[PDB]
Design a protein around this ligand. Structure first.
Ligand SMILES: *CCC(=O)N1CC[C@@H]2[C@H]1C[C@]2(C)Oc1nc(-c2cnn(C)c2)cn2nccc12
Length: 256
């Protein structure tokens, strides 16, 4: 699970994330990698290192592969697959792409395939959103930072706009909490990176979600697509669908 830091050649800074900067680089001077440098005091480092053994055993084509960690020094490095086209939210807000509805549905399929893998492994993301998704050189969307919310040491960390009512009121996390977030993620894609509940503050959003407010139908979304995303927002969690069911629904629409 340990990667030698010297086998990394640092090339370009990519930006900043929740735990610090991310740099582009070569591993043994041949394979592209992303090097996440974790700011000291921002991660429960002992717990993350034990969990990394589980995360490295998660292999799926639509899951951002974790190649290993560099923990012998501080700050520690997280070495992941490189995603040439960056964060999904920024990709969606780039209007030059002139996206077709089918491309948006493929992004939804990509995430749904990855989340079905995780559901099969009993692994919860706990923060599914377009900001935690990355896009590669071929337009493939992949899910990133799955489960990392459990190791953030900042108290103010909360993703209210992606949270079902039982989480906002009781902190009851489950597979159904990820399902709700996926419904919001579909809305984000069909709204081209629009913030969920754009007219409300984080406090008003939860107040309205308790009263029963639901996201509206994005302009680029058909009735059938909206139906899939609205299914993720049933007030009773037990009534929300499985990632297996959502994938079958997306493939049905993709074929039609
Ligand atoms: C939407 C949230 C966001 O802006 N980020 C979360 C992850 C970090 C930023 C994007 C960054 C810096 O991580 C990565 N960025 C790229 C990237 C950005 N621009 N180009 C041309 C590439 C590529 N990555 N591969 C893995 C992680 C990142």
């Amino acid at each position: 699970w340990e990667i030698d830091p010297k086998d990394l050649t640092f090339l370009k800074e990519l930006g900043t994330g929740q735990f610090g900067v991310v740099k582009y680089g070569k591993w043994r001077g041949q394979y592209d990698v992303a090097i996440k440098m974790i700011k000291e005091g921002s991660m429960s480092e002992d717990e993350f290192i034990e969990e990394a053994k589980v995360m490295m055993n998660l292999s799926h084509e639509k899951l951002v592969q974790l190649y290993g960690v560099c923990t012998k020094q501080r700050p520690i490095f997280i070495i992941t697959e490189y995603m040439a086209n960056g964060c999904l939210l920024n990709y969606l807000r780039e209007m030059r792409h002139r996206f077709q509805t089918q491309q948006l549905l493929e992004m939804c399929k990509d995430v749904c395939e990855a989340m079905e893998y995780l559901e099969s492994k009993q692994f919860l993301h706990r923060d599914l959103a377009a900001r935690n998704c990355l896009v590669n050189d071929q337009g493939v969307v992949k899910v990133s930072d799955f489960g990392l919310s459990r190791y953030v040491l900042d108290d103010e960390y909360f993703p209210v706009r992606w949270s079902p009512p039982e989480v906002l009121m009781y902190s009851k996390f489950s597979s159904k909490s990820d399902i709700w977030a996926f419904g919001v993620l579909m809305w984000e894609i069909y709204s081209l990176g629009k913030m969920p509940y754009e007219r409300f503050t984080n406090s008003e959003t939860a107040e309205h979600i308790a009263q029963g407010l639901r996201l509206y139908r994005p302009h680029l979304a058909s009735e059938k697509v909206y139906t899939i995303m609205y299914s993720c927002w049933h007030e009773k969690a037990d009534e929300r669908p499985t990632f297996k069911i959502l994938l079958s629904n997306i493939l049905d629409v993709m074929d039609e």
